[PDB]
Chains A and B, each alone.
Chain A
Amino acid sequence: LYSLRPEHARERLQDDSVETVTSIEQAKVEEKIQEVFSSYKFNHLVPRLVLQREKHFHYLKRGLRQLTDAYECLDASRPWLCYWILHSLELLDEPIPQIVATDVCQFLELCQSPDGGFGGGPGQYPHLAPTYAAVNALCIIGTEEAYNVINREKLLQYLYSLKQPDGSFLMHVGGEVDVRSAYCAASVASLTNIITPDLFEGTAEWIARCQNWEGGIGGVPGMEAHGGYTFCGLAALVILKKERSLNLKSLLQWVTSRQMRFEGGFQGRCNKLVDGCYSFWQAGLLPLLHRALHAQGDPALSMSHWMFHQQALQEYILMCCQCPAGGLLDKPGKSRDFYHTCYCLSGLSIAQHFGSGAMLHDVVMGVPENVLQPTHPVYNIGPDKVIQATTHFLQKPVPGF
């Protein structure tokens, strides 16, 4: 285990005897993480990195049917719970009963607006985040029933009701604006094949103005580079076939710096703390930049690994981001939730699966049963789900005018 290795101690924070709120809080995290690593080197047994599959399963098992009033805060994000949970099972290679599926579908039909798009729950206004979530859900189920739930013609009509002159999109009518919308839009429009010639006109340029002096991308022009928005940014472009509107080199140098040399996982932004969900938002950029660079015949790219320490990420996840009772999480001490369960797994998958044309090299830490199904680094659903959905919707024609 890379993290338990002796010299690894040396990758411990050096505050330079000049402490600020930052160095202090960073110190605390490492402190707790260390205790986790040293838990094994505690006059007992051999460290067994095991993915508590059976437990994450049961967790996800009910979550798909009911939630305690503890989730009243996600009452406007139900399409996500479907996606998050119904995607975690995917990665665990668990099956989605042909009955529960129809339920998910019927439910989403209730969340969908007669004005295109989906709301956070039955009868809520359409909002791109829920829309994104709803669509991946449906594609993960990949049945013509699921597909038919989506109203292609009004979904596009929705995308325009939100598109802005400067290229950006609103998250919803009278709502806010940031790269999340570009991604959500490009994610649904592309899968459902409704991309007109002027839908995303000027978006690649707007997205590009979000990349700042850090190399990463911010929510909006002028803001600090952040993993969550950086994914939405790059991913959106990859869909628009415009990775090159960005300075891919500064970006690469940025994302790579985002991985914590000690914890092993990533931070959403420079001098910020580690966090399990970023195993996908940050680490996910690598599979994406590998494509972009490679499509430019970059000769220095690797024939087997992504450009981050895949092992360290898997150790962080397995040893630090997993709750005994089930479900994954932010970091130790924090609570479990379907969000982190959905992204610590997706992240795990990416770090254990490598692609690049003829190249296929997996790296599974711990017991080989820790292998998850692969996830498409753009839509973050099954490569096959993506492929299947895309080909299926191209049988249909883009809402012609």
Chain B
Amino acid sequence: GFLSLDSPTYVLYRDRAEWADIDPVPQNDGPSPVVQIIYSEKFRDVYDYFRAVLQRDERSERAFKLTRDAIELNAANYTVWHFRRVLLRSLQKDLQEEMNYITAIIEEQPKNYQVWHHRRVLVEWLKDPSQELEFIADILNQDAKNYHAWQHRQWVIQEFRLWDNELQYVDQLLKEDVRNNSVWNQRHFVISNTTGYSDRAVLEREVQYTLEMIKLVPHNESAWNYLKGILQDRGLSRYPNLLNQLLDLQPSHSSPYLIAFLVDIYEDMLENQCDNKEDILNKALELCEILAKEKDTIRKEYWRYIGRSLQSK
């Protein structure tokens, strides 16, 4: 039986009968307070009693219900969450109910470390991950980039080892927003742990796919960072068609990303003793200067560092 902090008939704990046996404990900020918070009086109230209960380490059902309000007033108070999760152990609370709870809390405020770490704990205790991918998807449906949701999602996938349908989920989201960089990351996560990018059949698919996505949204930096990300480990110089492929795009699908990916190719070719080391370089130094003077000035220091490096090898 909980009485909602939002209930119109809510009564401060100092006016409750079931809590008269206990003296609340006011917080001690010392005699000369700094960054002192002038609490509301509902908040002061809840915590003065949390201090009391915590003080005498009262592992009771009322303490349990009190942590709920303490949490609702400041979901970021990790001491409360710790103590609460101590009561789950002592009072042997139905943890599947605790899931329902942490589920509501996360829904209402998903950018909180405590809330997710608390869910993680329940999941570990119950050793049950059956409802995680769905829960995460609902959160990610409200915020397709919630960093906690993804981090929690990878954790689940890699622990319970539930890979089989994730890359499918990744295609779903990229289709909903090809610029969701969290999804491209997720895509690389899924592959890096499933097949890897050695199987030419896969590298092919991905690179073909990525180039296609690039063609559709030329100025989508994620596709590019991904294209360079899956090829940079073996060296872009070992894919002779690639350079060509891109230069065809110069006119119809131009962007300063194309310009910069080329520099990366040239960079890697001098590194791997290409031929026309004289030629290729100037071409590379030209682009770096273009990027520095016109195409991508916000980072002239970088593109001017590049000529300057390739100027000494």
Contacts and interface: CB of A to CB of B under 8 A. Distances in A.
Contacts, number: 216
B299 A309 contact: yes
Interface string B217-251: 11111100110011010000000000000000000
Interface stretch (B3-11, B96-104, B128-136, B176-184): B176-184
A300 B78 contact: no
B195 interface: no
B180 A271 contact: yes
A63 B185 contact: no
A302 B305 contact: yes
A140 B305 CA distance: 35
A250 interface: yes
A305 B301 contact: yes
A66 B33 contact: yes
A103 B74 contact: no
B12 interface: no
A38 to B, nearest CB: 19
Contacts of A270: 181, 221-222, 225
Contact of B298 (A11, A172, A212, A301): A11
B43 A72 contact: yes
A337 B188 CA distance: 36
Interface in B207-222: 216-222
Contacts of A102: 32
B301 A307 contact: yes
Contact of A256 (B28, B150, B229, B299): B299
B34 A219 contact: no
B219 A15 contact: yes
B300 A78 contact: no
A75 interface: yes
Interface residues of B, number: 70
Interface residues of A, number: 86
Among A85, A125, A225, A250: residue with most chain B CB under 10 A: A125
A21 B177 contact: yes
Contact of A300 (B37, B113, B297, B312): B312
B78 A175 contact: yes
B270 to A, nearest CB: 14
A256 B299 CA distance: 7
A213 B230 contact: yes
Among A21, A220, A312: residue with most chain B CB under 10 A: A21
A226 interface: yes
A31 to B, nearest CB: 17
A76 B40 CA distance: 16
A78 to B, nearest CB: 5
Nearest to A63: B35
B149 to A, nearest CB: 11
Contacts of B74: 72-73, 75-76
Interface in B56-93: 73-74, 76-79, 82, 85
Interface in B291-311: 296-302, 305, 308-309, 311
A123 B28 contact: yes
Nearest to B121: A174
Contacts of B38: 66-69
Interface of A: 11, 13-16, 18, 20-23, 63-69, 71-78, 81-82, 85, 99-100, 102-104, 106-107, 110, 119-125, 127, 171-176, 178, 212-215, 219-220, 222-226, 250, 252-253, 256-257, 259-261, 264, 269-272, 298-302, 305-309, 312
17 contacts: A15-B219, A20-B176, A20-B180, A63-B35, A67-B38, A69-B37, A69-B43, A71-B37, A73-B74, A110-B28, A110-B30, A125-B78, A172-B82, A176-B120, A224-B182, A261-B297, A300-B312
